[PDB]
Design a protein around this ligand. Structure first.
Ligand SMILES: *C(=N)[C@H](C[C@@H]1CCNC1=O)NC(=O)[C@H](CC(C)C)NC(=O)c1ccc(-c2ccc3c(cnn3C)c2)cc1F
Lengths: 301, 302
């Protein structure tokens, strides 16, 4: 038993982290085979970041302007290119610690682990979700750029996120490993707002099932609802609509607990309309939406 | 602020499986020794009432199967230290980090690398509760998973998982095999005492709120340590030790708020409540962030 926010073991990713420096600008890179991936704004000075013409800045750089360090060993850069907002540095040595890996672009609501790094050195690991407004509610300080998000399946690391920036509200924005931002953001030193965020309903439902599996049942009720009437209330409260695919992927939890998905939906509807009344669920005073159905099944089975 | 675990790679490189008969659990391979729970030498029926000295004298080195993945490590010695089994193996682990064995206090936090059949599955952050349980997340086969902190490049191992209690909390030992709390490695009804709130960590959390500009709860009073301890116990809060006051030193200096002034502010929060206001966005006080965790998350950690 037990239920905790849980990250993937980070060792396979730790073995890939390096430091990348251009001028006075240092951040993290990801070293896979003979290529180092990092945010392109490493090539900017402080004045460059206000309105950077990245292609001009990169054409004015040479290989020796990039200092790559794996621990105390300098890696010689022998080529460079740019793919969207990611800079790619070919080095003259293959990383012997390279895991089996893939690059994927995740969907809102999906979760991943973040290895927060500074100066190429791993600092901490934690679990994140892609928000519906395509920000992530991360924990990142100065120098964290180039830290990555990932999932692990068997022995294969699927990289899904590279960190680029923080927004005025404190949430974070970044790219996939092709350099394309999640969301309407740009790698420029300007204050940028996100769209209004919403709550990930399928994840809240998974977490309520987790609560039942671990003995928290006070929020249950006899009632059921139709899917449409649930979605009407959900949208009223800025919750994402629940699709039939969502109902289906909740099936295993429904069977494990004996609680139909639409019965649990009636419970959540009651919680939205009435609140928690000073009570807590799994120790939380708010409805948690950063566990997927898969996460709950994995931790409870 | 968010619970974050230490990077787990240095510990992942030390996880192995240990099997006796059909019982498999996890072990920790450091240099040429593997550490694991001694109840690996028990059958399910043995666990109801085990005699560990008598079970272990019937074992030889060749009864223990130690595997790093599919690779067997030959056992060349064995001994029991309290509730931990130590197996000397014929291979020194090339991935051995700099390490230490530490016994932590209630309230201290650590990362747990949850493992199954020697294979790391997940990492999460835990606090040792004042009743010497942890609110962990463990399935069957997780025994022998370890808890740790990392300081510079040194791994301090502080917990090895042994058992689940009726309330669903977890119990275990340090790496010298001494249980935290009054628990035993026997399959009987065991109860954790009623738990309490970790005062030193609530104070750390309040300092963290002040650092972020959220300081409505600061009052103009101070208190003595004795008076605060006596009041706090009436609210199911732990009393503070001198060591607690010391580890709050850095946050007190960073904010300019004496530890005892913050104690008086917390005392007011307890006697008067929150009154529908929040601290760091939350209506509950958080008690599983240590002073070190606050400094970690707010500053550059390795
Ligand atoms: C990578 N190392 C950093 C990570 C940042 C640093 C602070 N916390 C993080 O997560 N990335 C950057 O510094 C990027 C560089 C860009 C991509 C060129 N910039 C930012 O993260 C960034 C940009 C703008 C603001 C900002 C600007 C004006 C504001 C704000 C609030 N009110 N006004 C008027 C915020 C902040 C910011 F961190």
């Amino acid at each position: 038993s037990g239920f905790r926010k849980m990250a993937f073991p980070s060792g396979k990713v730790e073995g890939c982290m390096v430091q990348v420096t251009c001028g006075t600008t240092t951040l993290n890179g990801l070293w896979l085979d003979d290529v180092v991936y990092c945010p392109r704004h490493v090539i900017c000075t402080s004045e460059d970041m206000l309105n950077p013409n990245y292609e001009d800045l990169l054409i004015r750089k040479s290989n020796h302007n990039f200092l790559v360090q794996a621990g105390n060993v300098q890696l010689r850069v022998i080529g460079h290119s740019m793919q969207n907002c990611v800079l790619k540095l070919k080095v003259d040595t293959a990383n012997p610690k390279t895991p089996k890996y893939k690059f994927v672009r995740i969907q809102p609501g999906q979760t991943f682990s973040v290895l927060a790094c500074y100066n190429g050195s791993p600092s901490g690991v934690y679990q994140c979700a892609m928000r519906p407004n395509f920000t992530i509610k991360g924990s990142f300080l100065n120098g964290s750029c180039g830290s990555v998000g990932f999932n692990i399946d068997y022995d294969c690391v699927s990289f899904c996120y590279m960190h680029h920036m923080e927004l005025p509200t404190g949430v974070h924005a970044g790219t996939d490993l092709e350099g394309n931002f999640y969301g309407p953001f740009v790698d420029r030193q300007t204050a940028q707002a996100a769209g209004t965020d919403t709550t990930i309903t399928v994840n809240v439902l998974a977490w309520l099932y987790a609560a039942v599996i671990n003995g928290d049942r006070w929020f249950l009720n006899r009632f059921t609802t139709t899917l449409n009437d649930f979605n009407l209330v959900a949208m009223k409260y800025n919750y994402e609509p629940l699709t039939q695919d969502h109902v289906d992927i909740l099936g295993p939890l429904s069977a494990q607990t004996g609680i139909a998905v639409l019965d649990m939906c009636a419970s959540l509807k009651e919680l939205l309309q009435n609140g928690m009344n000073g009570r807590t669920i799994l120790g939380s005073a708010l409805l948690e939406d950063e566990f997927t159905p898969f996460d709950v099944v994995r931790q409870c089975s």
